[PDB]
């Protein structure tokens with residue numbers, strides 16, 4: 273499979289919350305994972321609040337998943353130690369909690385140590401950079417940073433240095449990553465990413481790599497921009513690893529101001545359509561760019577955000593249908609799969 277063509281991790285995100293995509297329930301899914309990948313990231317059950325039952329830590333479900341990975345030839349990328357969305361915020365993560373810094377420290381110390389020798393790498397901090405298109409806190413940019421509880425409670429971006437230092441100490445073997453989305457656009461956010469990373473280096477913070485989520489569209493951003501944005505980070509240090517963490521490719525772009533080029537029916541690209549062919553080229557050009565811009569030895573891996581199209585968080589987005597992954601509705605490989613195979617080979 274895919275994993276056999278590369279010398280760095282080729283992973284996929286797995287559902288584990290009941291439903292058709294549940295990894296423990298779908299043997300067809302388990303067979304794809306076993307045949308094509310060598311690493312898995314929990315799509316949801318490893319987020320912050322899932323580590324607790326009320327105010328006590330509860331690792332039962334995540335342990336079941338980590339254990340399944342190990343028995344099925346997969347390493348595990350942890351997503352994520354720190355992240356802002358209220359739906360997954362532990363109950364202590366509040367502006368009213370006077371013990372915030374202590375509870376924050378306990379969180380990192382405990383879960384990083386708990387999984388110490390079973391998790392290969394971690395999204396230590398995820399989505400700390402401000403983003404004009406996703407500011408639920410409503411506070412605006414604080415010098416490029418998103419003003420989440422963590423930023424507020426610590427009075428600045430130092431919560432980031434702390435998370436990394438904390439994680440490194442609890443698990444000296446895990447690769448520590450900063451992860452985020454839109455930083456491949458090569459725009460404002462890319463610039464902020466560069467400053468954030470530079471700051472961390474200057475401070476001697478133990479960061480091992482930078483993850484690019486890569487939630488792109490068939491035609492945006494251009495690979496020329498994706499290339500550069502990756503280049504800029506690669507250039508900041510001689511050892512920093514680059515990891516594509518949540519790759520997926522939408523055939524529909526609802527921000528282009530052209531509604532005439534949108535597939536609005538589930539049947540449009542169920543079998544064959546121009547977008548599916550462009551998606552083969554799109555996946556290909558991206559992996560190629562990764563291979564050419566990131567030096568061997570600095571390759572953290574490429575992870576696709578899901579197994580089959582219907583499992584995708586983008587199966588439907590902006591009220592439009594989409595077919596974002598490598599495997600279709602029937603668990604058959606799509607042209608996107610071939611694009612990956614060709615890029616990884618020759």
Ligand SMILES: O[C@@H]1[C@@H](O)[C@H](O[C@@H]2CO[C@@H](O[C@@H]3CO[C@@H](O[C@@H]4CO[C@@H](O[C@@H]5CO[C@@H](O)[C@H](O)[C@H]5O)[C@H](O)[C@H]4O)[C@H](O)[C@H]3O)[C@H](O)[C@H]2O)OC[C@H]1O
Pocket residue numbers: 315405406453454485487492525527528529585
């Ligand atoms: O744990 C996981 C979470 O990490 C994950 O988080 C979501 C990640 O994606 C976020 O949404 C993104 C919002 O920004 C969009 O980009 C816009 C798109 O439009 C661009 O501008 C136009 C593009 O088209 C051209 O034609 C036109 O010329 C351009 O002007 C604009 O510049 C971009 O910034 C991304 O497409 C979205 O992915 C989302 O908010 C996060 O929640 O969610 C899953 C979870 O598992």
Ligand SMILES: [Ca+2]
Pocket residue numbers: 524525526527528529530531532533534
């Ligand atoms: Ca459109």
